[PDB]
Amino acid sequence: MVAFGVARQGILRQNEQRWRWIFRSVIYEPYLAMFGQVPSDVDSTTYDFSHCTFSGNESKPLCVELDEHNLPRFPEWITIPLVCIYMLSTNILLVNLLVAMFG
Amino acid sequence: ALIKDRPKFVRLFLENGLNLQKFLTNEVLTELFSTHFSTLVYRNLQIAKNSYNDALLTFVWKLVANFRRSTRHPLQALFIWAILQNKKELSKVIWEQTKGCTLAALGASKLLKTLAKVKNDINAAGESEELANEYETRAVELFTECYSNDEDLAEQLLVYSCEAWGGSNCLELAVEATDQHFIAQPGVQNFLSKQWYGEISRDTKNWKIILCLFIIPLVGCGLVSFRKLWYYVAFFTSPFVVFSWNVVFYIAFLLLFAYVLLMDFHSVPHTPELILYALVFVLFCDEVRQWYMNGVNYFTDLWNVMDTLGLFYFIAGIVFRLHSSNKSSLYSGRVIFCLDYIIFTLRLIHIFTVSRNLGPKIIMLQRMLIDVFFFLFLFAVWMVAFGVARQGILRQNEQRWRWIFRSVIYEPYLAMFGQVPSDVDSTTYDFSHCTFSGNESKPLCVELDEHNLPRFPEWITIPLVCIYMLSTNILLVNLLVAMFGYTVGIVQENNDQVWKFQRYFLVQEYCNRLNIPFPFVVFAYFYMVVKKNETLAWEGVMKENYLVKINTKANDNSEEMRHRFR
Amino acid sequence: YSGRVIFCLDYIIFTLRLIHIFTVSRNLGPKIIMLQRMLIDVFFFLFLFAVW
Ligand SMILES: CC(C)CCC[C@@H](C)[C@H]1CC[C@H]2[C@@H]3CC=C4C[C@@H](OC(=O)CCC(=O)O)CC[C@]4(C)[C@H]3CC[C@]12C
Ligand SMILES: CC(C)CCC[C@@H](C)[C@H]1CC[C@H]2[C@@H]3CC=C4C[C@@H](OC(=O)CCC(=O)O)CC[C@]4(C)[C@H]3CC[C@]12C
Ligand SMILES: CC(C)CCC[C@@H](C)[C@H]1CC[C@H]2[C@@H]3CC=C4C[C@@H](OC(=O)CCC(=O)O)CC[C@]4(C)[C@H]3CC[C@]12C
Ligand SMILES: CC(C)CCC[C@@H](C)[C@H]1CC[C@H]2[C@@H]3CC=C4C[C@@H](OC(=O)CCC(=O)O)CC[C@]4(C)[C@H]3CC[C@]12C
Ligand SMILES: CC(C)CCC[C@@H](C)[C@H]1CC[C@H]2[C@@H]3CC=C4C[C@@H](OC(=O)CCC(=O)O)CC[C@]4(C)[C@H]3CC[C@]12C
Ligand SMILES: CC(C)CCC[C@@H](C)[C@H]1CC[C@H]2[C@@H]3CC=C4C[C@@H](OC(=O)CCC(=O)O)CC[C@]4(C)[C@H]3CC[C@]12C
Ligand SMILES: CC(C)CCC[C@@H](C)[C@H]1CC[C@H]2[C@@H]3CC=C4C[C@@H](OC(=O)CCC(=O)O)CC[C@]4(C)[C@H]3CC[C@]12C
Ligand SMILES: FC(F)(F)c1ccccc1-c1cc(C(F)(F)F)c2[nH]c(C3=NOC4(CCCCC4)C3)nc2c1
Ligand SMILES: FC(F)(F)c1ccccc1-c1cc(C(F)(F)F)c2[nH]c(C3=NOC4(CCCCC4)C3)nc2c1
Numbered sequence: 161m162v163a164f165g166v167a168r169q170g171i172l173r174q175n176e177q178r179w180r181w182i183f184r185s186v187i188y189e190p191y192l193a194m195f196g197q198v199p200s201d202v203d204s205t206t207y208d209f210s211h212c213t214f215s216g217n218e219s220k221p222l223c224v225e226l227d228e229h230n231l232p233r234f235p236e237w238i239t240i241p242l243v244c245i246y247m248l249s250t251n252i253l254l255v256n257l258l259v260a261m262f263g
Numbered sequence: 264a265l266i267k268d269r270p271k272f273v274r275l276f277l278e279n280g281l282n283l284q285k286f287l288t289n290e291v292l293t294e295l296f297s298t299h300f301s302t303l304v305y306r307n308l309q310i311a312k313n314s315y316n317d318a319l320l321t322f323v324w325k326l327v328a329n330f331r332r333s334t335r336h337p338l339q340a341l342f343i344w345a346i347l348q349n350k351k352e353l354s355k356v357i358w359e360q361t362k363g364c365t366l367a368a369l370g371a372s373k374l375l376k377t378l379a380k381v382k383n384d385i386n387a388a389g390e391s392e393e394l395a396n397e398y399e400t401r402a403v404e405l406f407t408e409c410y411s412n413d414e415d416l417a418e419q420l421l422v423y424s425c426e427a428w429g430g431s432n433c434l435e436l437a438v439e440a441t442d443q444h445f446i447a448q449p450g451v452q453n454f455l456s457k458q459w460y461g462e463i464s465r466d467t468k469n470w471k472i473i474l475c476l477f478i479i480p481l482v483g484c485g486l487v488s489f490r491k492l493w494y495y496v497a498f499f500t501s502p503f504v505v506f507s508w509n510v511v512f513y514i515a516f517l518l519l520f521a522y523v524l525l526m527d528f529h530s531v532p533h534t535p536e537l538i539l540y541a542l543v544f545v546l547f548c549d550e551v552r553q554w555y556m557n558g559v560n561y562f563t564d565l566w567n568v569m570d571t572l573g574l575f576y577f578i579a580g581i582v583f584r585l586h587s588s589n590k591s592s593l594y595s596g597r598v599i600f601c602l603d604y605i606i607f608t609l610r611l612i613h614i615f616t617v618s619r620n621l622g623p624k625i626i627m628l629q630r631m632l633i634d635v636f637f638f639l640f641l642f643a644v645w646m647v648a649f650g651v652a653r654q655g656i657l658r659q660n661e662q663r664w665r666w667i668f669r670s671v672i673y674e675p676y677l678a679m680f681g682q683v684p685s686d687v688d689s690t691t692y693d694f695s696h697c698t699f700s701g702n703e704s705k706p707l708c709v710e711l712d713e714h715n716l717p718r719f720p721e722w723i724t725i726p727l728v729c730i731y732m733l734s735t736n737i738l739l740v741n742l743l744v745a746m747f748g749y750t751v752g753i754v755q756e757n758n759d760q761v762w763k764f765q766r767y768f769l770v771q772e773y774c775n776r777l778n779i780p781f782p783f784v785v786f787a788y789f790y791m792v793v794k795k796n797e798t799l800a801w802e803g804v805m806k807e808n809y810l811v812k813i814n815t816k817a818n819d820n821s822e823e824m825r826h827r828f829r
Numbered sequence: 830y831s832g833r834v835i836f837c838l839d840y841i842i843f844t845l846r847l848i849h850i851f852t853v854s855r856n857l858g859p860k861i862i863m864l865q866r867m868l869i870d871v872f873f874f875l876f877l878f879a880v881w
Contacts, residue, residue, distance in 0.1 A: 163608040170524045170601040182525060196681055206704065225594060233594060244676065251680045252740060253635065260748040261624075637860045641848070648844040655837040710830060718830060738871065746860075 270352035287337040296330035368402035410450035461501035464488040530587040573606035
């Protein structure tokens with residue numbers, strides 16, 4: 161969880177500057193990914209915005225880094241495989257290993 | 264008798280008054296090695312020495328060649344001669360005479376193990392393997408007897424180094440021949456534990472010493488039992504405390520790395536980033552020292568390669584991010600740093616293989632890769648089939664690689680854990696996300712017949728997805744669970760024995776170094792660059808005791824009654 | 830379109846042939862072979878599931 165959350169947050173948003181949301185993104189969401197929901201809906205560019213906050217005034221996650229124009233700057237070809245591997249590892253392999261050790 | 268392989272007659276001659284020490288003479292040994300050495304065995308030994316080679320292979324080959332051409336340790340030469348021609352009883356008879364036997368037995372087992380692989384014959388390979396196992400058991404039993412009788416002398420014998428038998432101790436030969444059983448025995452483990460705790464007593468509660476690590480003044484008090492100021496030096500020189508300090512330093516380094524990466528990362532590096540660079544520099548210096556100590560064999564381990572890759576990734580990230588003028592490079596440098604952070608963070612699993620509670624379970628992970636591979640093979644085949652079929656029947660002439668791969672592979676893969684593979688399989692809901700043209704970044708529309716009605720039939724799609732989900736999400740996962748359970752049950756009995764070997768590797772590698780706390784080891788390396796018999800007799804006595812024990816165990820059959828009846 | 834659908838089903842059939850051909854790998858073959866012995870458990874599972 162630590163590795164995945166830190167990497168994802170670093171590549172996606174920049175200079176968060178709010179402790180509660182740093183900890184919410186880094187730990188809470190990967191933890192929720194253990195049972196069910198995919199860790200991040202932001203890993204895919206197909207859908208984004210309308211929940212973003214360029215400033216920190218509101219209580220929402222910091223926006224994604226943007227290059228020239230409004231297009232997101234993060235590449236999907238490094239995010240999607242990362243989340244796929246993380247889910248395949250946590251949600252399936254580890255739980256089955258726990259079952260075997262319990263048995 | 265030696266020529267004709269008469270073990271019993273050899274024993275009788277030796278025990279009836281013959282002086283073997285005087286027997287073995289330079290001329291006699293030269294005549295014995297020069298000619299009686301089997302030509303087949305001679306060629307095989309030459310090939311093995313020339314091709315594979317080893318710390319002891321070269322030594323034995325050189326000794327053999329020297330004797331053929333023309334202290335001394337002649338009895339060891341005779342024992343080697345007997346072993347190399349596969350004489351079990353004669354080899355044992357000669358072994359019973361050597362002053363140092365445990366080392367001799369381990370060396371013989373190593374030699375047999377290295378010579379058995381080359382031989383193509385199956386039966387000869389099996390015989391050599393059996394002989395090597397017999398010698399390994401002999402050495403283990405002898406050392407157990409020695410340790411049970413006397414402990415300090417057993418440890419001294421372990422530490423004792425030969426005068427060019429192989430230039431190595433029993434530990435080195437046992438580890439080199441991957442003799443897990445010998446090292447796993449209680450005596451060697453206790454010796455390693457004593458060396459691991461250093462000065463500190465082994466009976467102290469671990470939490471006491473961990474607590475004392477943080478608060479310095481607590482060490483001066485009597486909380487720590489030093490007996491197995493001077494206390495500070497005796498404490499900070501213990502490899503256990505150095506390892507704990509290095510772990511703490513590494514964790515703090517990770518915290519600083521994460522903080523700089525996410526919270527404070529600007530075009531021009533600030534002070535915390537420079538401190539991070541300094542810490543990475545000391546880590547790189549340690550890695551360079553580790554490179555120097557070993558050769559290219561150091562790169563044969565996965566974790567070492569991973570660490571080297573992490574360091575090179577850090578250097579690359581530094582290179583990319585110094586172009587403060589161009590924004591497009593700072594982001595790439597940050598991404599490189601994120602990947603390097605993943606690599607560094609995965610190192611905790613490697614370092615925590617010594618915890619005595621997590622280490623065995625971490626070690627056993629390497630044995631489930633075949634089950635994982637089979638699972639992935641079936642999953643990939645099914646995903647390919649289902650995705651190709653569904654895409655073909657639903658949309659036509661996609662003509663965009665990224666979306667072909669997104670639909671064919673990504674969605675069926677997501678179907679493994681949770682969501683149904685496709686919301687398009689059902690006509691009840693569709694459109695408002697379609698794109699007849701490829702201009703937008705959305706999946707291609709479904710094929711349409713006359714009117715706007717979808718053309719695909721549900722009676723072939725819905726059963727397909729139902730079968731695919733029933734297969735992947737339930738059956739395959741349960742099969743994986745069952746295979747994992749069986750593998751754990753099989754390998755648990757050997758996991759601890761395997762883990763003790765790695766424990767020895769740690770307890771030797773850490774003790775070998777100068778044992779300076781990590782944050783300021785640079786000064787040590789810099790000024791080092793500037794500066795850059797009786798036990799054998801006791802072993803023989805215990806060997807005699809062990810042989811007498813074997814003879815008594817053999818005679819315990821109690822069959823003498825019938826012989827006395829006759 | 831019907832021909833394309835037939836081709837898709839035939840593609841599934843052909844793709845399933847890899848499991849058969851890879852029964853000789855000396856690492857996957859035994860595990861593939863053992864699958865034939867769990868059909869009764871699968872059948873019992875499906876029987877209960879269908880009734881419920
Ligand atoms: C390594 C093992 C343990 C698990 C791997 C799971 C696979 C399902 C991963 C491996 C590589 C992944 C692919 C790598 C690259 C891409 C392109 C990506 O499409 C893009 O948006 C690329 C960037 C762009 O838009 O140009 C969609 C996912 C896909 C097919 C990834 C989806 C899932 C794949 C096949
Ligand atoms: C200084 C700040 C930033 C870190 C605070 C986090 C702590 C919860 C970490 C820091 C150092 C860690 C310790 C470093 C080393 C060890 C020894 C380890 O046990 C062994 O390695 C014994 C080896 C053996 O049995 O041979 C158990 C955890 C402990 C106390 C670790 C547990 C968690 C600690 C206290
Ligand atoms: C929170 C983010 C922004 C910074 C990353 C901090 C990490 C370095 C911390 C977070 C969770 C911590 C871990 C939580 C669980 C464990 C296992 C634990 O292992 C043991 O104590 C072994 C005990 C035994 O076997 O006897 C040591 C502390 C460690 C690595 C903790 C110390 C370091 C970790 C990875
Ligand atoms: C190109 C994109 C996908 C980003 C690449 C970054 C990570 C996804 C890479 C960097 C290091 C890789 C890891 C290196 C080592 C391993 C252990 C491996 O499992 C084992 O080897 C268990 C046996 C053992 O202990 O060695 C599974 C993959 C993993 C986590 C690798 C998977 C992918 C990782 C995390
Ligand atoms: C074969 C084993 C391993 C698993 C099978 C799972 C069952 C739950 C499948 C087998 C046949 C399937 C049925 C085959 C045909 C249809 C009609 C289908 O309704 C239609 O839309 C048909 C086309 C039309 O609209 O006219 C709804 C699903 C249903 C009941 C399918 C739903 C699920 C069923 C019962
Ligand atoms: C991607 C779509 C559009 C085209 C379909 C290509 C398939 C033919 C590829 C995709 C995934 C591939 C497979 C991924 C995993 C495996 C298992 C692997 O099995 C072994 O190597 C056995 C090793 C051993 O047991 O020693 C051989 C390659 C194979 C069939 C790969 C080769 C062919 C596959 C099915
Ligand atoms: C009419 C609609 C639902 C489309 C039909 C196409 C597929 C759904 C059919 C074509 C071939 C069929 C497969 C033929 C063989 C098998 C193996 C069978 O499992 C075993 O027999 C294991 C033992 C063995 O190795 O033989 C489970 C069903 C499956 C995948 C069959 C299920 C349905 C498949 C994939
Ligand atoms: F049960 C289990 F442990 F899963 C497992 C069971 C059987 C065989 C292997 C494993 C295993 C072991 C390790 C290791 F021992 F090496 F840690 C794994 N590591 C990872 C990943 N590393 O990083 C990821 C998360 C962070 C982002 C990058 C990807 C996932 N997946 C592993 C699977
Ligand atoms: F654990 C497991 F393996 F599930 C399994 C466990 C116990 C008994 C049988 C199986 C098994 C084996 C195979 C085979 F060995 F034959 F491959 C299976 N094949 C399929 C399917 N084939 O194609 C589908 C995906 C592609 C679309 C059409 C349907 C599902 N389900 C299987 C179940």
